[PDB]
């Protein structure tokens, strides 16, 4: 739609990752976007993140929660390649090889909707 992958073509995305990797070791490049059609969570101004590699999916959710200023009791899920991870205790490092896109980013989307609502 107006998603990052639509705003920037594949080779441009791959070059961007290549450049940042040459500059910033031990950080994982992550695209974080609001799930299409989500209406109860805010937008972030940025979607391109550099995340220190030891941070887990659950910890990243805490970081994004803070930035969105969500109420602590608000439903919030961060999906990796649009689906739930088996464990949110995986570090950015350890899921990178598994979940990264060929362009070098890991793509995540956030939503307020649980798997079965």
């Amino acid at each position: 739609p107006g998603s990052f992958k639509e705003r920037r073509p594949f080779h441009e995305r791959q070059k961007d990752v290549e450049e940042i990797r040459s500059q910033q070791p031990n950080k994982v490049p992550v695209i974080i976007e609001r799930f299409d059609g989500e209406r109860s969570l805010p937008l972030m101004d940025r979607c391109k993140f550099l995340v220190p590699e030891h941070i887990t999916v659950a910890e990243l959710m805490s970081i994004v929660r803070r930035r969105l200023q969500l109420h602590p009791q608000q439903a919030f899920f961060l999906l990796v390649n649009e689906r739930s991870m088996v464990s949110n205790s995986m570090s950015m490092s350890n899921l990178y090889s598994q979940e990264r896109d060929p362009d070098g980013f890991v793509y995540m989307v956030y939503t307020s909707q649980p798997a079965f609502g």
Binding site: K48, F49, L50, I63
Partner: peptide, 4 residues
Amino acid sequence: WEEL
């Protein structure tokens, strides 16, 4: 880039 948004650097955490």
